[PDB]
Design a protein around this nucleic acid. Structure first.
Ligand SMILES: [Mg+2]
Lengths: 49, 50, 49, 1341
DNA sequence: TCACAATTCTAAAAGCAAAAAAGCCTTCTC
DNA sequence: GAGAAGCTTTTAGAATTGTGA
């Protein structure tokens, strides 16, 4: 499947139990189309390229 | 570079922190987001089904 | 703390002489060898079940 | 006495048992084997001589023609190991064989030959073995792993209970030849010997006897006794052997010699047996009913009628008794059947036999073996007499003959590798004997029934295969007789032999990629025994009796070093002192125990000799002069431990660590660890990656020096001498006069191995540890390889630890590191990648590697040079360009107007596609090396010329330097010889250094030595010139490449990786963990002295995972660091050597009666300060495996320092300043950094490329790819109500192509909605099913 | 006849991931 | 050289035949 990734898991004891910690790198790699949508919405980039 | 997982949900996964890995998937459509928020959210799964 | 008791060989026949030593003290070579019989049996069991 | 490399730092050695035997050279298993392979062996037992002398000479098909062997030779390799590792080829030797061809004359099969013809022949190359024990097959280092397999010979199995579900036990006897066919003798539920040949159709046994020319009379004579029946007065008074009827219940009266012995219905008891013996009861009166149920043994014919009476082996009846009585036959011989001991097994098998004569037998065998064609006489006899009775197709080896004759109790230990009538009949009789009850069955797990193949044996086998293929080829080519031509070099075809040996070495199951990120990893990969491979069992076919620790593994195979997962128990490791017989069986050394005293002569016992003695235990106390102090000792006699008197033991163990392998003998306090954690920590010590700076253990076992010296990572002084010169790259050692040859003044030059790349992409790098003008003896480490520290093995770093919880950040197995560990770069590692840009011969024109890339600005070209390759030392990052390559994509013309733009650029019709080599994303690094391989006949670019000129200058400088330093030493030795004998010191320098033999000296042996050295100088000149010319030749040579390839540019990036949250971080006691937080220094717990703790572990891992060894290691490490802290305090507040030597002596002289005695009165007061400087980081301590330190000794060493004996101190909270209650255990523990880095495990994907046949994402981080959503995840989604999530993951994220493009376009347009579609994999399935005759169709709406 | 039973042929044997290497018909030219 | 022509798992179920009455 697309829009999927792996990594090693560590422990975060500050989270509330409906939360997880997602690396910024993985988050940016998995959510690219949503970021394109928002970028073109804000006008920060006209064309997709 | 590592996913931070809550301590309490580790029993459900049977996961310790000595080298285990985890895969993360993104729901795209709106009904999949509702299903994740309503059926699969970790605050709904406090009792076992067994 | 207390002795680690009696160990069975691969055939299941309980070995007569127990392991009277515990892990705070040291096992000696023979006792450790019997313990290895048991440990290898357990690991094989899990890995193949 | 103490060798000078050992005086620099002594390891405080606990352990009280003297070590009677030194640990042997650890790589003997490989070196000895491959040496036995390639050597000139008169009398021809091993290796190439054995193979050639076995397959040669050739005898043509009655053609008066034969090829004769003479001898063989191995030439020198064309390249060296390093120049072969660079060029990407095999490190091998050509094999040159002196062959002869002699041809006879007509009507002269034995007379003098007409002609002889002789010269060399080249049957390909054979890979040589490096001095370490490895090969280089395509530039990559590889290891051929030893193989534990079933020994040839006869094995008597049981197959006890599962068959037939009746509680009856079958028996079978199998014959295993080294090469050939198998052969069974297997019972049935109805007690009839059947046979099968290589597990074909089960078939009655007696056939083979009949195939071996045995009439039924002979068979029954062999397999049975005889009972006499004589016609007499009446009723045939039977002639009884006195012991025949023992155990048999009587059924009638027995009277003979006027005395009644036995009444009916009463067994012959012991008293009755004694009566029979006393009375000499021979002829007894019996009814005729006794002969009613017997069996005729010998065939009886009719004489008067000249016809037959009865056939051999059929049940008799009284009418036949009358018929033969009246026929003349007066003596009747029956077979002594029984129900206790002698069953009628052979007789019943004969009854079931359908055949009648050897022709029928051989026809049946032929039909069984090769079913379908018509049997014929010659074919059947040839098939049978080649199945087991031919040197070409069957061979019991010498080990096979030995085991065979040992199973059947025959005394001979040598013979023929071919089965024989006697052998097979003996096997049958033995198996029947096992059935009857007198005998036992082999256990196949016994290490006496298992044998070891090493590199030599397997290589010789494959070479023999190649030789027999060449034999058939030469047979055919020479049978077509042409003579006086055909030099014995043309019919010989090197292709088969080369193909076979290359198939073995390059692509085989037991010839595997070398594990190389640690000296321990390499050495324990070389001493690895595997039950898998060609000729062995398999992972899934392995039961559990083979997955297990047999009692005969003791001292031969490690119990606690085997990989977890699928192949547990089959990848065993070989113990420290284990060895191998001449036959290939493991043996281990013991000390003879004669007359109570325990001598020191070492006997090497094998498993089938260990069972006939009582072996005492290694840690059984010995007193002065070697008695057992206490009067009875624990031993093991018959595969089982128990306690015996003093004067019954025959042997003793050599040490307390011969039971374990070399990986498990570097875990201190092993006996305090549960065997599972010992296993994990032994396996897990090999994944440790070398560190930027190596750091010795504070707590070791004394086995570090041996492991580091016996592997080929350090640079060990060949000959003792004085260090002439030191450098990061070179060491020059001036040899000593006592250790020098007559001529060849000489000096030892060691070139170190700087930052090159290992198989696991780690960094191997040698650092000099000696300093200028220093003595060195033999066996002294001069340079430290990776993970080495002054000779000692150093795999990790010795960190400061506290065992307590800390706010849940070490919750389950996580580890909480401090920032001071990262600031000090204590766990930083260097990794070297390699990146190849290959320019090919593609259609429409070849690629070019110019720097004129299109559709890029100058910003990315600021790094590449003129020739389009990056600069050495360039700090590249992810997405950059390393080599500018462009492919031609064919002529194009968008529009006529666009041409103007192409005219504006000045491009002039060039339209090429960018295909440059780019740094794979995310890996920052530095370009440390670049290599360029060019095909012969292509033009070397600017940078290729620069590289070639650079390395030519390097080569010339290197050879000039070596000759310069050698001649400097040579002339120094010449002057030294000129110390006496008419020395003119003033005239010594009147002329330059060259011509010193013309000075005024006598014409004696001194002048002879002078001429010797001068001729040595001249030969050095000649060798220099030849070597330089050859190196110039091969450096300019264009390398041989793949087909359709022009040039390959290889770049090397050197990355530096620091620990981060997510890296695995283990210890030696199986205690893993993943770093979960890098904490500030002021947040960590600290003690009353203000010293923070570096790492914090969880106490909860100790009880459940019963590894008490780590707490003991922590305590002893704390004690050692306390001693080092006092030494530092003294060595800082500058003292005099008196107090330092007194205190260090106090430290080295505490404990029980321990082996080592270190006396500092001999240290000359100058290296006492050097020793103290080496000890200011903590005194190293050696704690041997099963005879280590004790808690009383640990407490005494703690009390030597000013530490608390409890081991637990008072700590304060780092961020509240508040004392924790409950004193906590702090101390020093040896932490390893395993090679599971989180920046190699992370991976993510939004979209990418997809497979062809099924339009799904690719799979892997290497080829950017997605995650498998397997069927168990599908079930877990079905167990929720997640139907829409499931649909989208099945259609719009994997397969549905139009759906997923529409989903992308919808997402970028702020709309979250999918078009369902139907997966393309299902269409692929529909077509795959319609391609059968089936017609699967989707019905209408 | 018509019923047990020994042979023998057929299927099945967890999941997920990382790295590496070796390969992708014989043969017959002239 | 380039292009073709052509020798060991274990368990269990279901189908034969091989006597056995
Ligand atoms: Mg785990």
């Amino acid at each position: 499947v697309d829009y999927s990734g792996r990594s090693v898991i560590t422990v975060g004891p500050y989270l509330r139990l409906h939360q997880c910690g997602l690396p910024k790198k993985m988050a940016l790699e998995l959510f690219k189309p949503f970021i394109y949508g928002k970028l073109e919405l804000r006008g920060l980039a006209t064309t997709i390229k | 570079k590592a996913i931070q997982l809550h301590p309490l949900v580790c029993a459900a996964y049977n996961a310790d922190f000595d080298g285990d890995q985890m895969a993360v998937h993104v729901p795209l459509t709106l009904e999949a987001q509702l299903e994740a928020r309503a059926l699969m959210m970790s605050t709904n799964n406090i009792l076992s089904p067994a | 703390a207390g002795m680690r008791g009696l160990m069975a060989k691969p055939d299941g026949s309980i070995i007569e002489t127990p392991i009277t030593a515990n892990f705070r003290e040291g096992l000696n070579v023979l006792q450790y060898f019997i313990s290895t019989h048991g440990a290898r049996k357990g690991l094989a069991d899990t890995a193949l079940k | 006495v103490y060798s000078y490399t050992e005086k620099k730092r002594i390891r405080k050695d606990f352990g009280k048992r003297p070590q009677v035997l030194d640990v042997p050279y650890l790589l003997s298993i490989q070196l000895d084997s491959f040496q036995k392979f390639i050597e000139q062996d008169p009398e021809g037992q091993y290796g190439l001589e054995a193979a050639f002398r076995s397959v040669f000479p050739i005898q043509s098909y009655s053609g008066n023609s034969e090829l004769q062997y003479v001898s063989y030779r191995l030439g020198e390799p064309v390249f060296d190991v390093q120049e072969c590792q660079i060029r990407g080829v095999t490190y091998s030797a050509p094999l040159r064989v002196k062959l002869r061809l002699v041809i006879y004359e007509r009507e002269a099969p034995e007379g003098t030959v007409k002609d002889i013809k002789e010269q060399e022949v080249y049957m390909g190359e054979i890979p040589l073995m490096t001095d370490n024990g490895t090969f280089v097959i395509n530039g990559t280092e590889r290891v051929i792993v030893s193989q534990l397999h079933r020994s040839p010979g006869v094995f008597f199995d049981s197959d006890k209970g599962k068959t037939h579900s009746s509680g009856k036990v079958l028996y079978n006897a199998r014959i295993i030849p080294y090469r050939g066919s198998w052969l069974d003798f297997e019972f049935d539920p109805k007690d009839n010997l059947f046979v099968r040949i290589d597990r074909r159709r089960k078939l009655p046994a007696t056939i083979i006897l009949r195939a071996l020319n045995y009439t039924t009379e002979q068979i029954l004579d062999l397999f049975f006794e005889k009972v006499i029946f004589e016609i007499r007065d009446n009723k045939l008074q039977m002639e009884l052997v006195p012991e025949r009827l023992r155990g048999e219940t009587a059924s009638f009266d027995i009277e003979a010699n006027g005395k009644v012995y036995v009444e009916k219905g009463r067994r012959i008891t012991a008293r009755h047996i004694r009566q029979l013996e006393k009375d000499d009861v021979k002829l007894i009166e019996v009814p005729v009913e006794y002969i009613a149920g017997k069996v005729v043994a010998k065939d009886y014919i009719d004489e008067s009628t000249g016809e037959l009476i009865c056939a051999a082996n059929m049940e008799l009846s009284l009418d036949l008794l009358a018929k033969l009585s009246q026929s003349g036959h007066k003596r009747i011989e029956t077979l002594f059947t029984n129900d206790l001991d002698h069953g009628p097994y052979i007789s019943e098998t004969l009854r079931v036999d359908p055949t009648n004569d050897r022709l029928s037998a051989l026809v049946e065998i032929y039909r069984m073996m090769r079913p379908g064609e018509p049997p014929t006489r010659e074919a059947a006899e040839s098939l049978f007499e080649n199945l087991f009775f031919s040197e070409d197709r069957y061979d019991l080896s010498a080990v096979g003959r030995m085991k065979f004759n040992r199973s059947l109790l025959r005394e001979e230990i040598e013979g023929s590798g071919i089965l024989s009538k006697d052998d097979i009949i003996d096997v049958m009789k033995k198996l029947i004997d096992i059935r009857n009850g007198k005998g036992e069955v082999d256990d196949i797990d016994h290490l006496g029934n298992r044998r070891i193949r090493s590199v030599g044996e397997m290589a010789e086998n494959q070479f023999r295969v190649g030789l027999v293929r060449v034999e058939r080829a030469v047979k055919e080519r020479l049978s077509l007789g042409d003579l006086d031509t055909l030099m014995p070099q043309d019919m010989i075809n090197a292709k088969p032999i080369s193909a076979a040996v290359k198939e073995f070495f390059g692509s085989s199951q037991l010839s595997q990629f070398m594990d190389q990120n640690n000296p321990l990893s390499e050495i324990t990969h070389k001493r690895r025994i595997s039950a898998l491979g060609p000729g062995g069992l398999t992972r899934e076919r392995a039961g559990f009796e083979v997955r297990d620790v047999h009692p005969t593994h003791y001292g031969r195979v490690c119990p606690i070093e085997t990989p977890e997962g699928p192949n547990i128990g089959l990848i065993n490791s070989l113990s420290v002192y284990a060895q191998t017989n001449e036959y290939g069986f493991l043996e281990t050394p013991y000390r003879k125990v004669t007359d109570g005293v325990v001598t020191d002569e070492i006997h090497y016992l094998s498993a089938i000799e260990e069972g006939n003695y009582v072996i005492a235990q290694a840690n059984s106390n010995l007193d002065e002069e070697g008695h057992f102090v206490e009067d009875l000792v624990t031993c093991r006699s018959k595969g089982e431990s128990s306690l015996f008197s003093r004067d019954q033991v025959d042997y003793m163990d050599v040490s307390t660590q011969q039971v374990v392998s070399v990986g498990a003998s570097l875990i201190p306090f092993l006996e305090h660890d549960d065997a599972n954690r010992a296993l994990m920590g032994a396996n897990m010590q090999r994944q440790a990656v070398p560190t930027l700076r190596a750091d010795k253990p504070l707590v070791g076992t004394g086995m570090e020096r041996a492991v580091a010296v016996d592997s080929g990572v350090t640079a060990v002084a060949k000959r003792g001498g004085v260090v002439q010169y030191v450098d990061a790259s070179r060491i020059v050692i001036k040899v000593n006069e006592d250790e020098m040859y007559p001529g060849e003044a000489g000096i030892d030059i060691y070139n170190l191995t700087k930052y090159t790349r290992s198989n696991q992409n780690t960094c191997i790098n040698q650092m000099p540890c000696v300093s200028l003008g220093e003595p060195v003896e033999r066996g002294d480490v001069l340079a430290d390889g990776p993970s080495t520290d002054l000779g000692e093995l150093a795999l990790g770093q010795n960190m400061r630890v506290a065992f307590m919880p800390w706010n849940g950040y070490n919750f389950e197995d996580s580890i909480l590191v401090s920032e001071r560990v990262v600031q000090e770069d204590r766990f930083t590692t260097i990794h070297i990648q390699e990146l190849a840009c290959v320019s090919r011969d593609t259609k429409l024109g070849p690629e070019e590697i110019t720097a004129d890339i299109p559709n890029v600005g100058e910003a990315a070209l600021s790094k590449l040079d003129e020739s389009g390759i990056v600069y050495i030392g360039a700090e590249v990052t992810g997405g950059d360009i390393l080599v500018g390559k462009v492919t031609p994509k064919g002529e194009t013309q968008l529009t006529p107007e666009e041409k103007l733009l192409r005219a504006i650029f000045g491009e002039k019709a060039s339209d090429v596609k960018d295909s440059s080599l780019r740094v794979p994303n995310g890996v920052s690094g530095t370009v440390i090396d670049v290599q360029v391989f060019t095909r012969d006949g292509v033009e070397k670019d600017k940078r290729a010329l620069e590289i070639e000129e650079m390395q030519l200058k390097q080569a010339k400088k290197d050879l000039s330097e070596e000759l310069q330093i050698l001649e400097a030493g040579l002339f120094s030795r010449i002057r030294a010889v000129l110390v006496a004998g008419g020395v003119e010191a003033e005239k010594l320098d009147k002329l330059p250094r060259d011509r010193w033999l013309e000075l005024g000296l006598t014409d004696e042996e001194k002048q002879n030595q002078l001429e010797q050295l001068a001729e040595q100088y001249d030969e050095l000149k000649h060798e220099f010139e030849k070597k330089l010319e050859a190196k110039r030749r091969k450096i300019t040579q264009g390398d041989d490449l793949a087909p359709g390839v022009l040039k390959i540019v290889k770049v090397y990036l050197a990355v530096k990786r620091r620990i981060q949250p997510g890296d695995k971080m283990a210890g030696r006691h199986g205690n893993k963990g993943v770093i979960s937080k890098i904490n500030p220094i002021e947040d960590m717990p600290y003690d009353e002295n203000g010293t923070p703790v570096d790492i914090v572990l969880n106490p909860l891992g100790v009880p459940s995972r019963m590894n008490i060894g780590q707490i003991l290691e922590t305590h002893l490490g704390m004690a050692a660091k306390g001693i080092g802290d006092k030494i530092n305090a003294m060595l800082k507040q500058q003292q005099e050597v008196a107090k330092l030597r007194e205190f260090i002596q106090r430290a080295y002289d505490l404990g029980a009666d321990v082996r080592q005695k270190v006396d500092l009165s001999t240290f000359s007061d100058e290296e006492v300060m050097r020793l103290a400087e080496n000890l200011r980081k903590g005194m190293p301590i050696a704690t041997p495996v099963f005879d280590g330190a004790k808690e009383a000794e640990i407490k005494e060493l703690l009390k030597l320092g000013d530490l608390p004996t409890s081991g637990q101190i008072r700590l304060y909270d780092g961020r509240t300043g508040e004392q924790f209650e409950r004193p906590v255990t702090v101390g020093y523990m040896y932490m390893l950094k395993l090679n599971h880095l989180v920046d190699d495990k992370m991976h993510a994907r939004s979209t990418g490329s997809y497979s062809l046949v099924t339009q799904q994402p690719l799979g892997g981080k290497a080829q950017f790819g997605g995650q498998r959503f397997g069927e168990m995840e599908v079930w877990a989604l079905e167990a929720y109500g997640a139907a829409y999530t499931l649909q989208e993951m099945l259609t719009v994220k994997s397969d549905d192509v139009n759906g997923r493009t529409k989903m992308y376009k919808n997402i970028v347009d702020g709309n979250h909605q999918m078009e369902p579609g139907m997966p393309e994999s299902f269409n692929v399935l529909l077509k795959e099913i319609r391609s059968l005759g089936i017609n699967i169709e989707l019905e209408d709406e």
